[PDB]
Design a binder for this molecule. Structure first.
Ligand SMILES: *[C@@H]1O[C@H](CO)[C@@H](O)[C@H](O)[C@H]1NC(C)=O
Ligand SMILES: *[C@@H]1O[C@H](CO)[C@@H](O)[C@H](O)[C@H]1NC(C)=O
Ligand SMILES: *[C@@H]1O[C@H](CO)[C@@H](O)[C@H](O)[C@H]1NC(C)=O
Lengths: 97, 97, 40, 48, 49
C-alpha cells in the first residue's frame, strides 16, 4: 500500500529560539572558559545561520545543515568562544588538540 | 546537538499538518518519522509516557504533540504477489494471489 | 541505623510505554535487599 | 527454536553495526547522500 | 518487519481426515489397506493374525 500524504506535527510552541541572542553577543569568552546557553522549548530557524554571509566554517557532524531546519532536538547547547583563526583545526571531533 | 529518545524541545519551523485517522500517511511527530495506518487506540499511556514501543523495539504508538490522543502506528499493508498458471504450453491466462 | 531495602526503588527507566513485555535495561537503581539507612 | 531464531532476527534490526543509529529513516532524514551512503552501507552489511 | 507466515497446504481439519482414514483402515482391514484394497476382517480375528 502507498501513502496518501505526509503529516508533520511538531508541538504547538511558536516561541522563537535565541540564536540571534548568542550569534550577536558582545563578548564571547576566552576559549579557556566558554559561555554555553541551553536552548529548549522554542522554534530553531537554523536557516538564519546556514544562509549567512558571515560564517567562515559551517562544518557539521551527524546532521546536514540543509536537513537541520526540518528536524527536532531534545536540547541544543551553543558553546561560544574566541580563538586564533588557525586553531579551528583543533575545534573538530577526534583531533589531538 | 542532542538527539536522544527523550521527547524533543528545540524544533524546526515546520508546517503543522491536520491529523488524519484510518488512512495510510507518511507521518512525522516531534521529528520521529515513518509510514503507517494511524488509528486512535485504547492504550493507557501514563501521562508522562510520550510514545509506545513494541516487543520488536519498533515504535508502535505515539501521542500527537498538539492533541493528547494515542495514535497506534500500524504499517501500511503488504504481501508477496504470486501468479497461479498452467504451463504456457496450455494457456496464457493467469490468476494472482 | 541500617534497614532492609527489599523489592523497592524501581522506576520507569524512560518516557516510553511498553505493554506486555519483560523489558531489560542497565541504569542507576537501588540494589534489591541492600540497606537503606534510617533516620530520626 | 523457530521462535528464538525469528526473535533474534527481529532484535538484530535495532543493532547499530558501527552506523550512527539503527533507525534507517533517521540516517536518511539527518544526512546528505555522500555521508548517508557510508552510514546505510554499515547497516546493510550488518543486516545482510 | 518483512517477516510473513504462509499457511500449511493441509489444514489441521484435513490432517484429522487423514488420521481418521488411517484409523479406519487399521481397525476395519488390518494391514491389507497398505497393500491395496481394504479387505475387511473382524477385529478379534485381525488381532489373532
Ligand atoms: C545579528 O543580529 C541581527 C539583528 O540585530 C540579525 O538579523 C542577524 O541574523 C544576527 N547575526 C547573525 C550572524 O545571525
Ligand atoms: C495551538 O495553537 C493555537 C494558536 O495557534 C492555540 O489557540 C491552541 O490552543 C493550541 N493548541 C493546544 C493543544 O495547545
Ligand atoms: C546491612 O548492613 C549490615 C552491617 O551494618 C550487614 O551485616 C547486613 O548483612 C546488611 N543487610 C541487612 C538486610 O541487614
Amino acid at each position: 500500500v502507498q501513502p496518501t500524504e505526509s503529516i508533520v506535527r511538531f508541538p504547538n510552541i511558536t516561541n522563537l529560539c535565541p540564536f540571534g541572542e548568542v550569534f550577536n553577543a558582545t563578548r564571547f569568552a576566552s576559549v579557556y572558559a566558554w559561555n554555553r546557553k541551553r536552548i529548549s522549548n522554542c522554534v530553531a530557524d537554523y536557516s538564519v545561520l546556514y544562509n549567512s554571509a558571515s560564517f567562515s566554517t559551517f562544518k557539521c557532524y551527524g546532521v546536514s545543515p540543509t536537513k537541520l531546519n526540518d528536524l527536532c532536538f531534545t536540547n541544543v547547547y551553543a558553546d561560544s568562544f574566541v580563538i586564533r583563526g588557525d586553531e579551528v583545526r583543533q575545534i573538530a571531533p577526534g583531533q589531538t588538540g | 546537538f542532542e538527539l536522544l529518545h527523550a521527547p524533543a524541545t528545540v524544533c524546526g519551523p515546520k508546517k503543522s499538518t491536520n491529523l488524519v485517522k484510518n488512512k495510510c500517511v507518511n507521518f512525522n511527530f516531534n521529528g520521529l518519522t515513518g509510514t503507517g495506518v494511524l488509528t486512535e487506540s485504547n492504550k493507557k499511556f501514563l501521562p508522562f509516557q510520550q510514545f509506545g514501543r513494541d516487543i520488536a523495539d519498533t515504535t508502535d504508538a505515539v501521542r500527537d504533540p498538539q492533541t493528547l490522543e494515542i495514535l497506534d502506528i500500524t504499517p501500511c499493508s503488504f504481501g508477496g504477489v504470486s501468479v497461479i498458471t498452467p504451463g504456457t504450453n496450455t494457456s496464457n491466462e493467469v490468476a494472482v494471489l | 541505623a541500617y534497614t532492609n531495602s527489599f523489592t523497592r526503588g524501581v522506576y520507569y527507566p524512560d518516557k516510553v510505554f511498553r505493554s506486555s513485555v519483560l523489558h531489560s535495561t542497565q541504569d542507576l537503581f537501588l540494589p534489591f535487599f541492600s540497606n537503606v539507612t534510617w533516620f530520626h | 527454536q523457530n521462535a528464538q531464531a525469528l526473535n533474534t532476527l527481529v532484535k538484530q534490526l535495532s543493532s547499530n553495526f558501527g552506523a550512527i543509529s539503527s533507525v534507517l529513516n533517521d540516517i536518511l532524514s539527518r544526512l546528505d547522500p555522500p555521508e548517508a551512503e557510508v552510514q546505510i552501507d554499515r547497516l546493510i552489511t550488518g543486516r545482510l | 518487519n518483512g517477516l510473513t507466515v504462509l499457511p500449511p497446504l493441509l489444514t489441521d481439519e484435513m490432517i484429522a481426515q487423514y488420521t481418521s482414514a488411517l484409523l479406519a483402515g487399521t481397525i476395519t482391514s488390518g494391514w491389507t489397506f497398505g497393500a491395496g484394497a481394504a479387505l475387511q476382517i473382524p477385529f478379534a480375528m485381525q488381532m489373532a493374525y
